[PDB]
Design a protein around this ligand. Structure first.
Ligand SMILES: O=C(O)CCc1nc2cc(Cl)ccc2s1
Length: 167
């Protein structure tokens, strides 16, 4: 038994809720929150800017030190950093950005990072401003992630469509 509330169960291991990932992290304080990162860990907008804003920019300060030491992530890759005031840990995961020409086949690689963590609060990778089809992203999530994932879908209307079209 964990602390996630009001999620609809899609599979043995995948749960979904129409909710803002920021407000959910603040309430639950999960072990792992997933950020929809880019390879530079430049958290300007979407999940990354909203998560970063909620940390008062401490996520961006930590991230800049990480990049100065290690260089950029790979598309499909990840790193574990602090969760600040939102979670124990933040798993920064880089899904492909369709609005930049990145290979959508890298979405499966991106979701494989989640398998290193027993439980996660996450957004749909490559959905929203990343320009990929969220229905596809949910299918890849269900078919790739084997650990327990709690998906926070921000768009109400999208949430209803994801549930109603789920196979
Ligand atoms: O779930 C969706 O509706 C699409 C992917 C998401 N995009 C964002 C953007 C922000 Cl600022 C906050 C949470 C989310 S989750």
């Amino acid at each position: 038994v964990n602390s996630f509330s009001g999620y609809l169960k899609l599979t043995d291991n995948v749960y979904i809720k129409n909710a803002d990932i920021v407000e959910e992290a603040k309430k639950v304080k999960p072990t792992v929150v997933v950020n929809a990162a880019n390879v530079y860990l430049k958290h300007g907008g979407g999940v990354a800017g909203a998560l970063n804003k909620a940390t008062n920019n401490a996520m961006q300060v930590e991230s800049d030190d990480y990049i100065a030491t290690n260089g950029p992530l790979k598309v499909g890759g990840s790193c574990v950093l602090s969760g600040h005031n939102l979670a124990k840990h933040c798993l920064h995961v880089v899904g492909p950005n369709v609005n930049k020409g990145e290979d959508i086949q890298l979405l499966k690689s991106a979701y494989e990072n989640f398998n290193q963590h027993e439980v996660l609060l996450a957004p749909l990778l490559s959905a929203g401003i990343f320009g990929a089809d969220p229905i596809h992203s949910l299918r890849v999530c269900v078919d790739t992630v084997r650990t327990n994932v709690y998906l926070a879908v921000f768009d109400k209307n999208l949430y209803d469509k994801l549930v109603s079209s789920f196979l």
